Amino acid sequence: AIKKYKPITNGRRNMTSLDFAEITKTTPEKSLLKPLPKKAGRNNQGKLTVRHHGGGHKRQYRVIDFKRNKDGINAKVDSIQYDPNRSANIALVVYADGEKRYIIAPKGLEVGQIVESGAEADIKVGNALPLQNIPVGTVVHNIELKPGKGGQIARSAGASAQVLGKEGKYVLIRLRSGEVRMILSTCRATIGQVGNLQHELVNVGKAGRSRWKGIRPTVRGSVMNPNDHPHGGGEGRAPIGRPSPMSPWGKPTLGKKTRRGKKSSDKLIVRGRKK
Amino acid sequence: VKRTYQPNKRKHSKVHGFRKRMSTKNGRKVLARRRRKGRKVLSA
RNA sequence: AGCUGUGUUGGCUUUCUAACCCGCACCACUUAUCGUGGUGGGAGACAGUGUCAGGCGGGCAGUUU
RNA sequence: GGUCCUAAGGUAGCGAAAUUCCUUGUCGGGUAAGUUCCGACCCGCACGAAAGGCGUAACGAUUUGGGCACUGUCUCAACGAG
RNA sequence: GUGAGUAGCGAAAGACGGGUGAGAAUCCCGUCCACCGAUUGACUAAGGUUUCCAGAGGAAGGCUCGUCCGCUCUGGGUUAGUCGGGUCCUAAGCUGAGGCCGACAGGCGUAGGCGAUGGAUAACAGGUUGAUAUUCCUGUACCACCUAUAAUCGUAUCGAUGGGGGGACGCAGUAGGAUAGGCGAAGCGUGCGAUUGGAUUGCACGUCUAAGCAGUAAGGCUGAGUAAUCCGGUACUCGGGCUGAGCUGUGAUGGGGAGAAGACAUUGUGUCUUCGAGUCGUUGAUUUCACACUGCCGAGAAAAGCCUCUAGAUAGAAAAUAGGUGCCCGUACCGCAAACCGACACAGGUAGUCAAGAUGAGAAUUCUAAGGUGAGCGAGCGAACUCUCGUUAAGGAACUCGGCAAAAUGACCCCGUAACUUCGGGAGAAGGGGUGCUCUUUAGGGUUAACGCCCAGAAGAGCCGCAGUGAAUAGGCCCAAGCGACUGUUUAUCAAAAACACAGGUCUCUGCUAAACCGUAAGGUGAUGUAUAGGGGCUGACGCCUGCCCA
RNA sequence: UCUACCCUUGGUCAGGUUGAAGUUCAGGUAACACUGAAUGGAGGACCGAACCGACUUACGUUGAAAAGUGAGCGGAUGAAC
RNA sequence: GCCGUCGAAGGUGGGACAAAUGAUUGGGGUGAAGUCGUAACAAGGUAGCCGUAUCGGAAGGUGCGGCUGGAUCACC
Ligand SMILES: [Mg+2]
Ligand SMILES: [Mg+2]
Ligand SMILES: [Mg+2]
Ligand SMILES: [Mg+2]
Ligand SMILES: [Mg+2]
Ligand SMILES: [Mg+2]
Ligand SMILES: [Mg+2]
Ligand SMILES: [Mg+2]
Ligand SMILES: [Mg+2]
């Protein structure tokens, strides 16, 4: 779980780490790594879009198979490694063709697993097979959205989904945010819940390791004089004085919905969100 | 104190040089006014 | 007040595919995850877009006090 | 307890405070002597619960009052060197 | 012009003898004296572009003078197959054939190119000039290519723009192996004293490179036929060299350096020159030479040279010997500065390599070495007043907006230490004691066969001064409140905070061609991330909590 | 080319000091298993130079310098330069 | 007569325990019940009581568990 710390310093007063007991073979595989230069919000004009980014520690992207091809070949699981680009851990499967690849690792996985559409396809944790071939009440993750595209929905650490039922051409999926939604019946799904479940209790504990992860400070609005934030200065501290708290570009940020009338999402979203 | 001209042979040519004038279009209007006024040195 | 059923007008829906659309899959130009060409699979006369019209709009401008 | 009215019409906790005009509030401690300081009272001109309320070990080239130590800052100045 | 022959003369130790000259406190030569010495010393980048050097100059420039010069006239100075780049490779970025967008101009982008601050990459000692030296010439080398060649092996070979390995990587700590420099005692050369005394007693030095043969203290993994290849995957029964490696040993080397003898010239012109012998042993030993090894989480660039593999091309080349060829650009000079950026010969700023002795944990402090400099105005008199320092009777904040400035505390080794708390802290809490030199005994490592050498701690005895970290360098402390939790960051140049950040709490928005933002659009950021994840609003660790009102 | 964040590739920090997790041995455990002694070398940790800053004060103010020098002062293995 | 070991009292400093005292301050018993309500003992008129929370001027009221030391007809 989480290994705690003892308050020898005011920095390490309440800091709490995440114990690396589910990591085997800590060195990577030197044929599936691709370089990853950073950018802090610097698009193809050099300007600054999205704020609060940049710096920290160098990384190196690790090529992940989200497609789950190579039908009907038994894949062992060798070693469970660490991945900095994302919240889950990672796996190193070996297909019997000697084609070593990476899989995002579900909850308990060391044994050896199968990808096949409908042969028997062996519904267990780690096996990917399309949603027409999955019985109901079955916790899946890493679903595709468009057929043959690649697994998109629910890829986090400790995330999941749930197949509810089967409609006339689609299936019916309950997502992690609590939003029932129709997905086409030939999208794949890994069966299981993705591992590394103790992730959101990692108390960072210090403004320095919240700072070498690629985060910069975020100055509040009411301390900017009114050239650049609609919560401008005033003498002393001040209540906001608007009918609605505003983002730094005029739009009200506290309450107003933002999505627009969109193609192939109104006829599919049955229930909305629950928050 | 550290003054505001720290000289360099490369940034002086990669910015104000001849082939950075002729690069764009408005550089060829700068070079059209310095060989019009009658300057000796067109591009630094 | 309300029945019946033809000649003509304006809708609400429901389904099919021929435009159009895909930051959807292999395939060629090519030992380029750009592009165009090609059988699919999706969505489909809605969306994107042109002209007109109404409503919010200190996000921004011109000025009065 | 009566009664007017408001959409209900200041709860726990703090209180002459970075918040108190009059005010140098008042009684206690500190000094030979204390408009500043510390502990209390509460009649809050006008504290108050995420423009957070009340406490707090550790940390400060922070701000305010009192002790020992040391001294030309001082009573009171004099001499010498570049 | 007046201000006026006034303010200045830009940190800083000079004194004299000799020359030179029309002219000298200032130029050159000599002796003594002082100053830096983790630098005021020695090499290279950036930048400047002849300043460098010899012979002649004295109108201007130099804060004075000048015979002098970084200033004027004449004539000279920079040598590479091996050093730093280019003919080799790729990061961020830039540019982009077709293409996609836009009133025109033009913006974006795929294949391909450009781009070192990085990867690859064959030479080292000594001599010499008035100015250049891994460049010139002395002695030994090495990599690429070409030509003759013999022992020749022959489907033996050459292998891609293509498959594979490889190159290939963070911060932290500790124990090692070897070497560099250091210090002492005993290889050799010269001197042995006219200030009391002394004659194993006084100063100086203790050599050598790259190549190519050897054997090494440690560090890292254990071995076979089958499913664009016999290689790299995969899976199977059976089962002690492999690479990489600082350092050392001979040879390189009958050679070359050397503190000095001794043999030659006019001012020995302050010099060449011919031959001339030493180079042991002991210790203390790094920040140099591995990201090696163990641990930790924040998970630590790419492509080439190089090695194999086949598609293919061909059947022609090992070793060894001998001769031959190898291009372009930068080299002078200053380079923590009188030569660079500050208008100046300006008390500022300017990346990196080398860095010794004494005392010391130490690259701190005081005094010196190698090696440089004496700061381009001086001479007098020692009034007031300003500026930088030193000491003081009795009293000790009475001074004052205020203990503002100064004074005291300061090192190591010991005894001893409260409230309070998040149990880590408070704490160097506070308040206290001891230290010098000489002589006698004994217990402590490592080195070594051992005398020998360095590292140390105990008691006891004794001596001297006013004073024993005797000089320089090095915390004042305590009680009680206020604001902010902390380390951090802010108004280059009147404000460093109680303001900003912060770890944590919430609230709301986003189902993926996501919301949000930049851009008229194409394209991008968000992200090669997907509700334990992203954008925004307020509060600001931790503890106990957050009350009623929806007109 | 100054400064403000920022991307790719490098470099630099004398020394000395406390002693977090763990691991091993011993003591009890066989119940609910926790005390000591060694070893290990953690941290926006403490004292201090280079190095980076600019708190108090005196001088300077037709300055030596259109922002500086003298004595002291804070950070110094990182949110560093 | 001088030197040294041991040595009461004194002076210096941080603590440890009781006691005397102190602006205000919180409950407690005492009376005499004037002030405000009836919470128990009858089924005391909402059956009581023990733990444990949360609210109110005042006894106290409600929630979730246990007890009969719970009338009627003892709640068949
Ligand atoms: Mg306006
Ligand atoms: Mg030294
Ligand atoms: Mg020094
Ligand atoms: Mg103290
Ligand atoms: Mg204290
Ligand atoms: Mg778009
Ligand atoms: Mg500075
Ligand atoms: Mg600053
Ligand atoms: Mg019971």
Author numbering:
A (entry chain L2): 2 to 276
B (entry chain LG): 2 to 45
From the study:
Ribosomes are the cellular nanomachines responsible for protein synthesis. It inhibits bacterial protein synthesis by binding in the peptidyl transferase center (PTC), the active site of the large 50S ribosomal subunit. The acquisition of linezolid resistance by methicillin-resistant Staphylococcus aureus (MRSA) is now of global concern. Using a rapid workflow for cryo-EM data acquisition and data processing, single-particle reconstructions enabled determination of 70S ribosome structures from the Lins and Linr strains of S. aureus.
We examined a linezolid-resistant (Linr) clinical isolate of MRSA from an Australian hospital by single-particle cryo-electron microscopy (cryo-EM). Genome sequencing of the Linr strain revealed that linezolid resistance was due not to the presence of the cfr gene or to any mutation in the rRNA genes but to the presence of a single amino acid deletion (ΔS145) in ribosomal protein (rProtein) uL3. The mutation in uL3 sits at a location greatly distal to the PTC (>20 Å away), and we sought to use high-resolution structural data to reconcile the architectural constraints in the ribosome with the drug resistance phenotype. The deletion of Ser145 induced a contraction of the rProtein loop, while most interactions with helix 90 in the 23S rRNA were retained. Comparing the Linr and Lins structures revealed a large shift in G2505 into the binding site of linezolid. This shift was mediated by the change in orientation of G2581 in helix 90 due to the change in uL3. The rRNA bases undergoing the largest shifts are U2504, G2505, U2506, G2576, and U2584, all of which either are within or surround the PTC. Data for the Linr ribosome were collected on an FEI Titan Krios EM operating at 300-kV acceleration voltage at defocus values similar to those employed with the Lins sample and using the same electron detector.
